Amino acid sequence: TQAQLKLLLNEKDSMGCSPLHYASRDGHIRSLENLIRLGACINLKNNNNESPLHFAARYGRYNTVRQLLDSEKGSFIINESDGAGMTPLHISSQQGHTRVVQLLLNRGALLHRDHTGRNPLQLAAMSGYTETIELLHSVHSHLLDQVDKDGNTALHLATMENKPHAISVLM
Amino acid sequence: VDYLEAAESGNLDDFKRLFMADNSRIALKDAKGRTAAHQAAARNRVNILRYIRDQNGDFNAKDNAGNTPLHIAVESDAYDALDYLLSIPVDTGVLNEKKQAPVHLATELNKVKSLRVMGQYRNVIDIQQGGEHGRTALHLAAIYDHEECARILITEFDACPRKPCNNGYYPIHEAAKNASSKTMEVFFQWGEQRGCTREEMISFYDSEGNVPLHSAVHGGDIKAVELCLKSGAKISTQQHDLSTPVHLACAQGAIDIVKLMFEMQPMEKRLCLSCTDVQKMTPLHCASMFDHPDIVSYLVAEGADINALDKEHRSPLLLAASRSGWKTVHLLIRLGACISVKDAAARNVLHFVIMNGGRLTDFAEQVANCQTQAQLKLLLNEKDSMGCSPLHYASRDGHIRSLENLIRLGACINLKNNNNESPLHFAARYGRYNTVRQLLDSEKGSFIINESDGAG
Amino acid sequence: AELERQRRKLRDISRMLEQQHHLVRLIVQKMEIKTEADDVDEGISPN
Amino acid sequence: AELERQRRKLRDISRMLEQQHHLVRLIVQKMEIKTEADDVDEGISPN
């Protein structure tokens, strides 16, 4: 049946998730390699325009991120937006996964704003993750005090939703 | 319900009598599973829609996603029915649930001939019409790499990419980020013939200042870069972060792109390559910060500035050692590193080796083989701002293994900081047991077992 | 009066569990050198 | 009413962890004599 019945590797469900989205969302390091080996599409996007790397960075799947990037088309997807404008450096730092944002920086994830105007340190300061603020400030020190489209800094955003541990660090 | 299977199948003069019976069933423009009489043009029923036009039916459907009568035809294959629908002055500006005009379906779905049907009319429709995020109909031909749908729009509908979206991007930016190597070709060649030229597209500004050569290395495609260099883009144009494209490459490790743009513009290697941005980092700093030991071989061979300082006063050797890239600090030493530099807290490179867990035996083995060792082991006894020599940093942080190597290489044991504290005063204070035990049974261990400090 | 049931959790983890770390470090002593543990020293970190 | 959540910490450390000390003492029985453990006796210390 295999003549050409491997189009069900790239076949979306109701929510748009192809079976490579289900691998990255739930860990499954072993079966992730087999989908890539059989030629599943890497940068295939669901109805919210999210690649599986946006799933892998969001749930903190470390080894899933690392073996998506060193395949082919890994340089194309290291800094790619979604529907909201966020790269996987925005998504991983928003959730506070420190080992993933450490991994994406060492492989040259570039920096740019999302559609709201925020850099990766605005988002990590909105949530209370004061481990990811101190990492990003040591690498890129200029993005502490630049503003989004509303003029807010990183200190306004951590004050608008009551994170007192991330104010004593930003000051 | 009678005209549902009638207008879809019969569609000529008996469906129109059945639709006269369907209007006699309840009324005309009655609801259905999809919409009111939307199934006519879905099956290319020209005469049934002509009888619907004769009875003056609705020309605006709301089929649970607001897919109108023109949008329901182009979503299917209804090439001939739209020619009557566009002869009628129907409204061509209604947006769906996904915020799409009927122009934004014929490009996003690569409906080639359905654009040509819309091209003969060309004055009842609008091409600069805001879609999803304000993406016009030429943004979506640049994202998905539909080179023929972009070929039709620019020479027939008479468009030029001067309409930014609601985030600042122009269609040359969206085609360059997404590695649309084919779609970029028709802007630079077939867009010249309208009034939006090569030298004018190449100088578009993003919401951050990104010239589309900056956006050619966000996408990491080597072919989309050389299209921007054939059209005359300089590699010196800086961002709002004052970064050049030679900063953005070399931070990715794209060795194939940094040498490509040095071949096509050999003039700029003086103006760039000494082009400190915000945070004052030369393009050699950016390649040693992220542990890329093959670009820093190339940049010095092209005449770099091997030990140029920056903000916070760090040489590229110190910058590559604070990040614990240990493959690129062995390379810089064997290439003329000038190991005497000290940053803003007077920490030299041996401070950063010990506080980052680096291996120190093979580090000193490099300086011995590079013949600097003649007498450049005075940086073993070299205090920082707080007076702490690198043997203080070993005892304060544990590091039993690297403590032996400093003693074996002849660091001074009883060397005191500004509060007159030997490293044994550090080792006893933080409870480091094995650090105390192997300071005492060395030489000068009987001299330091009972020695005071500033407080006594 | 639940404060005496705040020490029954640390009566066991400081006599069994703290010894449990020593039993397994006795095992890996005899097979292969571990790198994370036996390269730092005992005591309290400054930060 | 949190006193029932003062026994859920000792329901596990007295059935798994207290057994966990026995499993590893079963392992080191078969390789090499440990000196700290099997030279004192069971029971309660006087001090």
Q: Which of B430, B435, B437 is the best mutation test for C, with the most CBs of C within 10 A?
A: B430
- Alpha-carbon distance of B111 to B77, in angstroms, equals 9
Tokens coding B9: 């199948």
Chains C and B touch (3+ CB pairs under 8 A): yes
Q: Which of A110, A118, A137, A141 is the best mutation test for B, with the most CBs of B within 10 A?
A: A110
C-alpha separations of B428 from B117, B209, B414 in Å:
87, 56, 14
Q: Which of B401, B405, B421 is the best mutation test for C, with the most CBs of C within 10 A?
A: B401
- Alpha-carbon distance of A28 to A36, in angstroms, equals 13
The position carrying tokens 């210390």 is D45
Count of CB atoms situated within 10 Å of the CB of B358: 18
CA dihedral A45, A50, A51, A57 (to 10 degrees): -170
- Chain C contact for B434 (CB, 8 A cutoff): yes
From the list B125, B170, C17, A141, the residue with the least C-alpha distance to D14 is C17
Tokens coding B108: 């996003």
- Chain C contact for B425 (CB, 8 A cutoff): no
Q: Which amino acid is at B189?
A: Q
Query: How is residue A5 annotated by DSSP?
Result: -
Q: Which of D2, D9, D22 is the best mutation test for C, with the most CBs of C within 10 A?
A: D9
- Chain B contact for A142 (CB, 8 A cutoff): yes
From the list B158, B173, B147, B96, the residue with the least C-alpha distance to B125 is B158
Beta strands, E only, chain A: none
From the list B181, B89, B168, the residue with the least C-alpha distance to B142 is B181
- Alpha-carbon distance of B121 to B436, in angstroms, equals 90
B45: phi then psi, degrees, rounded to nearest 5: -90, 95
- Alpha-carbon distance of B334 to B327, in angstroms, equals 12
From the list A92, A86, A31, the residue with the least C-alpha distance to A61 is A92
The vertex-B305 CA angle with B304 and B308, nearest 5°, equals 150
Cβ contact B363:B397 at 8 Å: no
Tokens coding B94: 């209604």
Q: Which amino acid is at B177?
A: K
- Alpha-carbon distance of B192 to B178, in angstroms, equals 22
- At residue A53, the 3 state secondary structure works out as helix
- Alpha-carbon distance of A42 to A88, in angstroms, equals 14
- Alpha-carbon distance of A17 to A44, in angstroms, equals 9
- Chain B contact for A140 (CB, 8 A cutoff): yes
Cβ contact B442:B449 at 8 Å: no
Q: Do A76 and B220 touch (CB under 8 A)?
A: yes
Cβ burial, residue B31 (10 Å; 0-12/13-18/19+): exposed
- Alpha-carbon distance of B403 to B386, in angstroms, equals 20
- Three-class SS of chain B: CHHHHHHCCCCCCCHHHHHHHHHHHCCCCCCCCCCCCCCCHHHCCHHHHHHHHHCCCCCCCCCCCCCCHHHHHHHCCCCCHHHHHCCCCCCCCCCCCCCCCCHHHHCCCCCHHHHHHHHCCCCCCCCCCCCCCCCCCCCHHHHCCCHHHHHHHHHCCCCCCCCCCCCCCCHHHHHHHCCCCCHHHHHHCCCCCCCCCHHHHCCCCCCCCCCCCCCCCCCCCHHHHHHHHHCCCCCCCCCCCCCCHHHHCCCCCCHHHHCHHHHHCCCHHHHCCCCCCCCCCCHHHHHHHCCCCCHHHHHHHCCCCCCCCCCCCCCHHHHHHHCCCHHHHHHHHCCCCCCCCCCCCCCCHHHHHHHCCCCCHHHHHHHHHCCHHHHCCCCCCCCCCCCCCHHHHHHHCCCHHHHHHHHHCCCCCCCCCCCCCCHHHHHHHCCCHHHHHHHHCCCCCCCCCCCCCCCC
- Alpha-carbon distance of B248 to B246, in angstroms, equals 6
B260: phi then psi, degrees, rounded to nearest 5: -70, -45
The H-or-E segment that residue A25 falls in is: helix A19-25
B62-98 per-residue burial string, b: 16 or more CB within 10 A, e: under 16: ebeebbbbbbbbbbeebeebbebbbeeebebebbbee
Q: Do C19 and D21 touch (CB under 8 A)?
A: yes
Cβ contact B94:B68 at 8 Å: yes
Count of CB atoms situated within 10 Å of the CB of B279: 17
- Three-class SS of A121-145: HHHHHHCCCCCHHHHHHHHCCHHHC
Cβ contact B34:B64 at 8 Å: yes
Classify the phi-psi angles of C42: left when phi > 0, otherwise alpha if psi is within -120 to 50, otherwise beta.
beta
- Alpha-carbon distance of A73 to A52, in angstroms, equals 13
- Alpha-carbon distance of B278 to C17, in angstroms, equals 52
Cβ burial, residue B150 (10 Å; 0-12/13-18/19+): buried
Q: Do B431 and C44 touch (CB under 8 A)?
A: yes
**Cα end-to-end span (Å), chain B:** 103
* Stated resolution in angstroms: 3.2
- Alpha-carbon distance of B314 to B349, in angstroms, equals 10
- Alpha-carbon distance of B137 to B146, in angstroms, equals 12
- Alpha-carbon distance of B95 to B74, in angstroms, equals 14
- Alpha-carbon distance of A91 to A48, in angstroms, equals 14
Cβ contact B56:B90 at 8 Å: no
Between positions 312 and 341 of B, the ones with CB within 8 A of A are 312
Classify the phi-psi angles of B111: left when phi > 0, otherwise alpha if psi is within -120 to 50, otherwise beta.
beta
Q: C44: which chain B residues are within 8 Å (Cβ-Cβ)? A: 430-431
Q: Which residues 6+ apart lie within 8 Å of D42 measured at CB?
A: none
- Give Rg (Cα) of chain A: 17
Listing DSSP states for C13-27 in one string gives TTTTHHHHHHHHHHH
- Chain A contact for B278 (CB, 8 A cutoff): yes
Q: Which residues 6+ apart lie within 8 Å of B201 measured at CB?
A: B161, B170, B172, B187, B188, B191, B212, B231
Q: Do B253 and A108 touch (CB under 8 A)?
A: yes
- Alpha-carbon distance of B341 to B332, in angstroms, equals 13
Task: Give all chains having 3 or more CB-to-CB distances under 8 Å with chain B.
Answer: A, C
Nearest-neighbour CA in chain C from D47: distance (Å) = 15
- Three-class SS of B381-425: CCCCCCCCCHHHHHHHCCCHHHHHHHHHCCCCCCCCCCCCCCHHH
The H-or-E segment that residue D21 falls in is: helix D17-27
- At residue A35, the 3 state secondary structure works out as helix
Task: Give all chains having 3 or more CB-to-CB distances under 8 Å with chain D.
Answer: C
Between positions 1 and 40 of C, the ones with CB within 8 A of B are 39-40
* Percent of residues in chain D assigned helix, strand, coil, to nearest 5: 40, 0, 60
Q: C24: which chain D residues are within 8 Å (Cβ-Cβ)? A: 24
- Chain B contact for C41 (CB, 8 A cutoff): yes
From the list B60, B66, B54, B70, the residue with the least C-alpha distance to B19 is B54
- Alpha-carbon distance of A112 to A129, in angstroms, equals 20
C-alpha separations of D12 from A130, C9, C24, D17, D20 in Å:
33, 10, 20, 7, 11
C-alpha separations of D14 from B327, C12, C22, D9, D38 in Å:
49, 8, 19, 9, 21
Tokens coding A23: 């691998």
